Amino acid sequence: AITHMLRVIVESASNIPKTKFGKPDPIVSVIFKDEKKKTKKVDNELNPVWNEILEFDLRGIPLDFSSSLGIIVKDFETIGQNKLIGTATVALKDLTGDQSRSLPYKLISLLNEKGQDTGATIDLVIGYD
Ligand SMILES: [Sr+2]
Ligand SMILES: [Sr+2]
């Protein structure tokens, strides 16, 4: 039996909210089935670009109707815990089946801790290897 991987390209984000002083330093956490991989941070940027590629071992478990990807965008803090900008959960059901394909996932709204749209978005490309 062959190994399959979920491929996530973190492309960019837009309209990250301004901070009172200085500028936010965005960094994205990508979580698939509790495995977390991060991007690099981008310094002092409201519209960051990464073009970073992450791949997760599916470990023989196929994608199904309920499969999803978690995204958390935070503002890097050198001292202690980074600051939340927003989250998204992305439905992966369009990748189900045995056909390798990639799809764009554009203008994904990032939601704050109250679940409100922040006006910021992230763009991904996600594929089934
Ligand atoms: Sr900064
Ligand atoms: Sr910061």
Query: Could you please report the per-residue DSSP string of 74-127?
Result: EE--SSSSPEEEEEEEEE-GGG-SS--EEEEEEEEEEE-TTS-EEEEEEEEEEE
CA of 77 to the centre of ligand 1 (A): 8
> What is the separation of C-alpha 83 from the centre of its chain, rounded to a whole number of angstroms?
16
CA of 30 to the centre of ligand 1 (A): 22
Taken in order of first residue, the domains within the chain and their CATH numbers are 1-129 (2.60.40.150)
Question: Which ligand is in closest contact with the Cα of 27?
Answer: 2
CA of 73 to the centre of ligand 1 (A): 14
Closest C-alpha among 61, 50, 74 to residue 125: 50
CA of 86 to the centre of ligand 2 (A): 14
Question: Which ligand is in closest contact with the Cα of 76?
Answer: 2
Q: Using a CB cutoff of 8 Å and minimum separation of 24, what contacts does 82-89 make? A: 82/27, 83/24, 84/112, 84/113, 85/16, 85/17, 85/24, 85/26, 85/110, 85/112, 85/118, 85/120, 86/110, 86/111, 86/112, 86/118, 86/120, 87/111, 88/122
CA of 91 to the centre of ligand 2 (A): 30
